[PDB]
Amino acid sequence: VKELLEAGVHFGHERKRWNPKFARYIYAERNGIHIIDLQKTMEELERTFRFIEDLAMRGGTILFVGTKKQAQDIVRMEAERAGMPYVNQRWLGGMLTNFKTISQRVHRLEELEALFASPEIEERPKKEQVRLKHELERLQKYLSGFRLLKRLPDAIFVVDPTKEAIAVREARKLFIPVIALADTDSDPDLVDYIIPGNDDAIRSIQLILSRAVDLIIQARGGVVEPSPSYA
């Protein structure tokens, strides 16, 4: 499902603002910008997906983590397309480690889904209506991709391990594997199944997530044609 034209979509970026552990994956520093070996990238792409592919044909959950602007919407695209939980906005502290209490809040979301599904007592105070309707807007913003999650994932997928070090930590504490796209600023050893590539160009975010989500449904029954993506 892979390719050889990933250099036609990213080949990596970012200057001498690196993590010295990532050295084994970098080829050269070009325009004062570290350039990732793409040959090295594929090697892991093989290894990484091999793990993903085993999880897909076993039918186990995946958690998609990405909150930078570059990977803001492009997760909601690919995650729903895989039908698996994601996080688009603020990654709440303790979603995994304190799952029981975090998930205790989704039952309020499902509770608001209940009441505002019409009608049950619209004779409730005008201020009361306003609050809850406002409260629904709030919960939806953060918990939209997290309600799909009803148990602790068999793995989590991350856009920026540096940016989402909090998540990685929780998974580390819970023996939950970490698959991730990661450029030169990230800690390679902290990631289990690593995708050493650009995490800012919306190109590479697409290729890596899509071809992952393509691999997701492919071993789950059927194949499909390319997904929606703004150039």
């Binding site: 930590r169 580390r172 504490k173 023996f175 050893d189 902290l190 289990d192």
Partner: protein, 137 residues
């Protein structure tokens, strides 16, 4: 430099804490004999006579444990512990009958003897004592 031997052991110990694939020590026909024992007893993947800027060195290829689970994915060491026993400040000599069992058997005491560099096991085998070089486990 005042203790060539210790420097080596320290070069190794330091290099293993950051999991270097290899590391270089200034060469010596005695450092080699020690390194030989270190490789055979399975502490290191091995060594080879290299050159650095025309100068003789010994490159030592380091051996570690498997990738680990949890918050610290750092593998275990193969050399958890290595340190000088005898020193320039104080030469430590033991007869055969007083050769210590390193870690109840799980480790070795490298020793320099009048019949070559031997381990504690081998010393009792060959039946000789000598200067206690170091202990490793």
């Amino acid at each position: 430099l005042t203790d060539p031997i210790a420097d080596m052991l320290t070069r190794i110990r330091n290099a293993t804490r950051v999991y270097k694939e290899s590391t270089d020590v200034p060469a010596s026909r005695f450092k080699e004999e020690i390194l030989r024992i270190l490789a055979r007893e399975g502490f290191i993947k091995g060594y080879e006579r290299v050159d650095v800027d025309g100068k003789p060195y010994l490159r030592v290829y380091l051996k570690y444990g498997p990738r680990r689970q949890g918050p610290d994915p750092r593998p275990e060491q193969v050399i958890h512990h290595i340190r000088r026993i005898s020193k320039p400040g104080r030469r430590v000599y033991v007869g055969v009958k007083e050769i210590p069992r390193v870690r109840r058997g799980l480790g070795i005491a490298i020793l320099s003897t009048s019949k070559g560099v031997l381990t504690d096991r081998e010393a009792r085998k060959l039946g000789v004592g000598g200067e206690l070089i170091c202990e490793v486990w």
